[PDB]
Amino acid sequence: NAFANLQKVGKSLMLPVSVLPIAGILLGVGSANFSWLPAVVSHVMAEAGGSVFANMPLIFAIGVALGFTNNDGVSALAAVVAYGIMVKTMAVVAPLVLHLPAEEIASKHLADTGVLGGIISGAIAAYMFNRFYRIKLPEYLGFFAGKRFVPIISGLAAIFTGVVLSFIWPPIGSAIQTFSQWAAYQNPVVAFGIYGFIERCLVPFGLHHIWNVPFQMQIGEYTNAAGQVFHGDIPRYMAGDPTAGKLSGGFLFKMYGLPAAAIAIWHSAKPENRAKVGGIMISAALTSFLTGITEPIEFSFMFVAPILYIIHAILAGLAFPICILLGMRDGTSFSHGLIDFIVLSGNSSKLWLFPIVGIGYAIVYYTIFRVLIKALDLKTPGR
Amino acid sequence: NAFANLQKVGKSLMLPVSVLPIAGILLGVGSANFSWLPAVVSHVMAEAGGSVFANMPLIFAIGVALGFTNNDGVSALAAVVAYGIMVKTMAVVAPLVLHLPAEEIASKHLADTGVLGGIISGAIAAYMFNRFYRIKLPEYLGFFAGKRFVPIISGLAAIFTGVVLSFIWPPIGSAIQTFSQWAAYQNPVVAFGIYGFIERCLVPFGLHHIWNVPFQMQIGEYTNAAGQVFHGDIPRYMAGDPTAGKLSGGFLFKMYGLPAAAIAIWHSAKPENRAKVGGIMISAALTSFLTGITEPIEFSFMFVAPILYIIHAILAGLAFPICILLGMRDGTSFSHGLIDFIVLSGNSSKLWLFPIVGIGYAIVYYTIFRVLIKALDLKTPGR
Ligand SMILES: OC[C@H]1O[C@@H](O)[C@H](O)[C@@H](O)[C@@H]1O
Ligand SMILES: OC[C@H]1O[C@@H](O)[C@H](O)[C@@H](O)[C@@H]1O
């Protein structure tokens, strides 16, 4: 059941992403320094959003623990304990292993685990909960027995894992740093084209959350004037990173093409199966256009027309290079929709080109889908 | 149902306490600087325990949220978000309200909420979960609907509450600071005598957790060489505070008298109801002697012999002044037992007097219970 196990990783890694909108509303608006809001309000909102982003590794740990424990809050408490213990164990052991000052390591994040550390801590907590949450102790130790024993063993395992990972990290950490530097600053064009293609390829099976975690949460490192450091395209754009927003190509298809593809599916639908198909597809198009959720649109032609899905994946992969080359920069919280498009427009660049290239993308999607449905006789909804 | 509501507060405030043993094992041993352990091991364990104690307000928020949401992990995630948002909102607004530098406020903790802030955040998260965890949104916004909407509204409410409390705190905070200073440094004798008496009076109904939260977690302020600041007798003793350990009077009755009271109950039991009574009471005595859990012993004579319970409460209240005056200093993690007595003995003082005064307390309890059962015909277990 490896395939199902991988899915639970995707769902568990999605939950930390679902709480980004509150960070986007606060940090996105606050960092924009809108003239129609007092500076105090913007500063407070920015600080609140930065607080939300400072706990992202802990939120990931909680997500993993809840995903692998049927959403039990004691597992979340164990994840908190284990994440704290592991982070402090690594921070105190790594200077000894590397024989370098702790301050330099912290500043350069040589031993920093971040989201991966949160995932490891949450996995430890989930395993300890699943094994020991029914542990029977001697009658005179019955108090610590059960869910009460989970945090203690989780913390012990956490300190052990902290020592082990303080020994193990340097190589994998250097590899991760090199990959992040490449994909963020050296060749972001091909990097994010591949990201888009692989994400569309993985969306059918739920692994796109796993594939997104690096690009959305880890690659890149931006520090604001307050000294807080952000990792990933999403937090870095919300924080106000001029180099972020490389995921802006999501808008081009999510808000224009997939809705245009749905419109094409509606039009190509038979008249006897046209009204209901149009209702379903307009609902899906509105969903993808406002929130950015593509699954109602993509699942319609995911299996019946694999050729259409491959063409969509290629176009989506090309969307990100198009925006990067054209300078179109606008970020999202969870998925690329109109709400995120407007709320997060404060730090955007060339926001006017988005409707233009979007109309182009809609025309391309509509024409391609209509032509290939007529030619290849693809059985899109309503057939 | 106010009485039941108060109970849920006690249970919810107990859960943060139940994860103290891992802090006690690590911080208690690590801070002791035992010669039979390498300095590196002790330092690592101390840092891990300090990490556990740094998140105590967050652990309290999670406890409240889980207690008032039937232990749902999404409520814990909402509590994390809300606690972070509220803490940074207060830290950024209070300097404006008080017109004082933020650094001075943070150092002196003038606007610090701590455990109370965690409780407030957890209450916000629990209320928002209970109200909105079934919220129905427009079909095109269905993604944010449900448990996904709880963290966003919880964070908004958290920032609003942060502003309100940054306005409201100074008076109540000054009152709390004065009470803590008094009970910790000015008249700890009467303070902890009253604490013991009221704790024994509230144990029957579960409010003793609420009554303990201030003394255990808030009164006092100790900072170690690492710069971490601890609040409450328990963390301060674990950290190595010479002035802490005022709860050491718990041992005198929990490990000696209540077990001695159980032995007296066994002896006074009728021969036909003596073997099983002795088994039950020896199990209870072992529980209270090792872990410190008094409920098995106290509930035996709680209702049948209210006079005995009142005498026990008075003796327990006198226990803490006795230790304070005699200098007997030894701390606990959750309750006063032999495991905590040994593990946390590294920072103890006059550990030799504990068995002596304990034998005295056992003699007193045994004599009093036997005499009053023979005289007043109190129907202790086995009658
Ligand atoms: O699965 C929900 C959403 O997750 C986002 O990260 C993806 O970009 C979208 O394509 C998807 O609809
Ligand atoms: O209720 C469990 C335990 O809680 C502790 O805080 C009290 O000191 C004990 O008397 C009690 O047995």
Numbering used by the authors:
A (entry chain A), B (entry chain B): 4 to 386
Question: What are the paper's exact sentences on this?
Answer:
In Escherichia coli, the glucose-specific transporter IICBGlc serves as the major glucose transporter and functions as a component of the phosphoenolpyruvate-dependent phosphotransferase system. The IICGlc-domain is the membrane-embedded glucose transporter domain, and IIBGlc is the soluble cytoplasmic protein domain responsible for phosphorylating glucose. Protomers can be divided into an N-terminal (TM1-5) and a C-terminal (TM6-8) functional domain, representing the central scaffold domains (SD) and the peripheral transport domains (TD) in the dimer, respectively.
Utilizing nanodisc reconstitution in lipid bilayers, we successfully captured the IICGlc transporter in two functionally relevant conformational states: (i) a symmetric dimer structure with both protomers in the inward-facing state (IF-IF), and (ii) an asymmetric dimer structure with one protomer in the inward-facing and the other in the outward-facing state (IF-OF). In the IF conformation, the position of the substrate binding site relative to the membrane plane faces the cytosolic side, whereas in the OF conformation, it faces the periplasmic side. A major difference between the IF and OF states is observed for the glucose OH-1 binding, which is coordinated by the F337 carbonyl oxygen in OF and by the N215 side chain in IF. The ring oxygen atom is weakly coordinated by H211 in the IF state. Considering the size of glucose (~4.7 Å for O-1···O-3 distance) and the narrowest pore diameters of ~3.6 Å, the glucose-bound states obtained by cryo-EM likely represent the substrate-bound outward-facing, occluded (OFoccluded-holo) and substrate-bound inward-facing, occluded (IFoccluded-holo) states. In the IFoccluded-holo state, these involve M17, H211, H212, E298, and crucially, F146’ from the CL of the opposite protomer. Consistent with the physiological role of IICGlc, the glucose in the IF state, awaiting phosphorylation by IIBGlc displayed enhanced stability, remaining bound throughout the simulation in two replicates.
